[PDB]
């Protein structure tokens, strides 16, 4: 990558934003500790061990409850302009309910964070919610899968409220959700995740749900809840300088081959991934592709649900790592989708016609190089809906590490790889700057290595090092150095 | 129109085909003569003058059986480079089967047309089925309502066989089809057409039909019936100079709005419209968006009748005469589709959201003239479904000419709205040409003024008048009169 070519600060507009981001549950750890509730990634891991790739937990993650201060120290070494973060529900709210009664401590620990970063100059971008949701909730009503979709939607609402009411007054920067296709497609589609339900037939630790279903239900939810929530929030604590949104994880699209059919194809796979809460965010409603295709499995909303939901966001948080090549499936009795996903009738290939993937290989079983995805998703969120606000939210690879594989804590701090990855992307967002995007930020996925989900601690996302076996000591990583030479040259 | 606004001979390729167009039933008569058989269309309008507008039949049309001779003249004085015009399969095949036997009068009679066209050095288009469908077909097992997929599928191959083998060595250009949605739609969805037939509660001759599914039946055998006649073509008749397709009837499609949702819509509009028809001859299946929303209403071809569609056409024509503003409509609960049109999920608007028309009104309650949609559709055929080789096998206007406002045949004969329409038509197929599209030919639509299906004689669409009042007595228009300065230059 060319010495001109590498990204610059002077590129972006001084109002531009950089940062890192992380989520509660894989970095805080203290996963019982100060009243904290238990949490369906708290009961996932310690009830299935075996569906973990490495057989970890957060338990203890990167410790980032007891040691955030550090974490805020690296984000001002950077010169990072904000931090994105999460809030564990279940350790605001112990039951995850009102009458749960509000945790103190929970409380207490964002409370110091915030302060802190604002004390450093470090913009606060809060993720209400990112996966974690109380087990108790889940034993009541199954969460996010909540049938009656009344009960999920007003726990949230009221957790988003406690949020709102010890925080309003210092985060001005509010994401209701993180990755939501991920979450419900992962972990009520494939099981992958906590509570890991999959239609029968599947491999999940639960093969007694519907992969055909339950997403839908769960997103459905997740829309309502995201919708009441900013609704709560326009109303009483929105500020001419405060805004709120949500994040999405998305992949891009490129049609397999030069059939216009592949076109279509990949039309379908941006509408079931990046459509399926996004327009419901901007319209009021679900892709037209989705709804022919799931049908009956995708519920419909109330007339007074989509007003709420219609416009229901100020900017918006965008997940990008990879792309994929989207190839056709025509409808047939040959075929019957048996994932949520298989609903756009579309393959998503690693591997175009000619055998060689999208893009270079970045280290773990899924990420693959492709930043001109970025760039198509981005000219989507300008051309097709209405060019708002965009801040990408997640961005990064992750390094193996396995125990048969360790990646030597020499070759783990020389992430070069990584480097070239950020720099890559970045440079790609000053390509679509200039073509009109409206990108506001840049958010480095994985200010610290942590618990990787299913991939427990198999894979080092951060740009900062942790030494789990050292207390969990951190060292910026030459990534995380050029960072720091980018903010504060 | 500006007189370098008009086009002139040169503007196109020598090999450039220019002519005129007719169907059958609608300019022949005879109906009973000669031992031809009774059609859907005889039927129809005996039983049911109700149903026509004017109460007419075309018992003697524009009588050409008797003079054809006269028609000839007609189009080698005004410079034709073809003609073309459909065979009755009622006059061929009485029964409409092999077994009824072949009627030597019907035969001899297309024998003499065009052997006469070709003496004149004009080059026959011959249309195989135009609508007219033995009525022995019709009463033995509905004709295209077949619900068995083979008895239709094989009368109407017996049929073409029957063509081949009587006018193979003088024919050249082979039309299975003209207006195959056209025809599907009106006769079993809306019922306007013979046999009358529409869903219980639906204003047609029979309510007793399926709107939402006769119409797919009808055309599923139409595409069977054309995959057979074109193997069976290639297979014995082909020769390196003849060709073989079908026509499609099809309207412009035009957004209603910006809304990313009209584009769509407007693209589930030319899906159902042209491609229905299209891309299964193309790629051997019906459009995505066509099976995704009729479902199980649309029958699925096996893997060997997909075999024979795709690529069953060595040429392809576009009767076009206007265009539509495509408006989205949502699945939701608040909508059902009540016609096989329906199932677009898109409103056909003749006005956009400012109130005007998408083009200036021709006449009729239909015809809107907008040569840009021509263009479109030539952009979609050249850029989407391979640029095939394209004759316009109709387009025109019809001049109103009804007992309560007749229309003076001094007024009939200054036709120069329709003039005025057919030049533009004519200009845009040459902006067409030099951006790449690969149309050949276009044919006038109506050489003579005939019978109008459910409009009867209230429509003068010829650009020859023909005066029912002196013995169908043919007179030239402004129009034909332009047509053969242009050819004769
Ligand atoms: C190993 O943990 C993950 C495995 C797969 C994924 C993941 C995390 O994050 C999502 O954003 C994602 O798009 N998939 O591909
Ligand atoms: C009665 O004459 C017709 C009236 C309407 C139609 C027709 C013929 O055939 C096609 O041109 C068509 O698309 N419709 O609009």
């Known amino acids: 990558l060319s010495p001109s070519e590498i990204p610059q600060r002077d590129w972006f507009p001084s109002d531009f934003t950089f940062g890192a981001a992380t989520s509660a549950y894989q970095i805080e750890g203290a996963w019982n500790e100060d009243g904290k509730g238990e949490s369906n990634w708290d009961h996932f891991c310690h009830n299935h061990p075996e569906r973990i790739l490495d057989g970890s937990n957060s338990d203890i993650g990167a410790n980032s409850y007891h040691m955030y201060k550090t974490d805020v120290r690296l984000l001002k070494e950077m010169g990072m302009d904000a931090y994105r973060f999460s809030i564990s529900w279940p350790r605001i709210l112990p039951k995850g309910t009102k009458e749960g009664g509000i945790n103190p401590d929970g409380i207490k620990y964002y409370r110091n964070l915030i302060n802190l970063l604002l004390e450093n100059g470090i913009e606060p971008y809060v993720t209400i919610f990112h996966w974690d949701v109380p087990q108790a909730l889940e034993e009541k009503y199954g969460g996010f899968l909540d049938k009656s979709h009344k009960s999920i939607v007003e726990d ?71 919708a009441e929530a900013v609704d709560l929030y326009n109303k009483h604590y929105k500020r001419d300088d405060t805004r709120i949104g949500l994040a999405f994880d998305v992949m891009g699209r490129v049609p397999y081959g030069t059939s216009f059919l592949d076109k279509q194809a990949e039309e379908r796979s941006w509408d079931i991934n990046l459509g399926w809460f996004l327009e419901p965010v901007v319209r009021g409603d679900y892709p037209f592709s989705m709804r022919s295709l799931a049908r009956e499995r995708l519920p419909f909303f109330k007339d007074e649900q989509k007003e709420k939901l219609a416009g229901s966001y100020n900017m918006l948080g965008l997940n990008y790592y990879t792309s994929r090549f989207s190839k056709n499936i025509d409808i047939s009795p040959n075929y019957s989708p048996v994932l949520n996903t298989d609903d756009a009738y579309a393959s998503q290939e690693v591997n175009g016609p000619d055998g060689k993937p999208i893009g270079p290989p970045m280290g773990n079983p899924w990420i693959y190089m492709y930043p001109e995805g970025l760039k ?20 990064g690879i992750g390094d193996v590490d396995t125990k048969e594989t360790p990646l030597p804590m020499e070759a783990a701090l020389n992430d070069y790889k990584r480097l070239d990855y950020i720099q890559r992307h970045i440079a790609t967002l000053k390509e679509s700057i200039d073509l009109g995007s409206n990108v506001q930020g840049y958010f480095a996925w994985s200010l610290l290595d942590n618990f990787e989900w299913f991939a427990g601690f198999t894979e080092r996302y951060g740009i900062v090092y942790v030494d789990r076996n050292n207390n969990c000591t951190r060292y910026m990583k030459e990534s995380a150095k050029w960072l720091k030479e980018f903010n504060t040259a």
């Open 156 to 226: 949230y609402t009221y957790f988003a409220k406690v949020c709102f009411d010890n925080f309003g007054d210092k985060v001005k920067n509010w994401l209701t959700f993180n990755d939501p296709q991920t979450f419900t497609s992962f972990s009520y589609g494939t099981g992958v995740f906590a509570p890991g339900r999959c239609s029968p037939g599947l491999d999940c630790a639960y093969p007694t749900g519907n992969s055909l279903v339950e997403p839908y239900t769960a997103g459905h939810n997740i829309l309502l809840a995201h």
């Open 376 to 395: 198509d998703l981005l000219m989507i969120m300008k051309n097709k809906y209405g060019n708002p606000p965009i801040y990408i939210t997640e961005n």
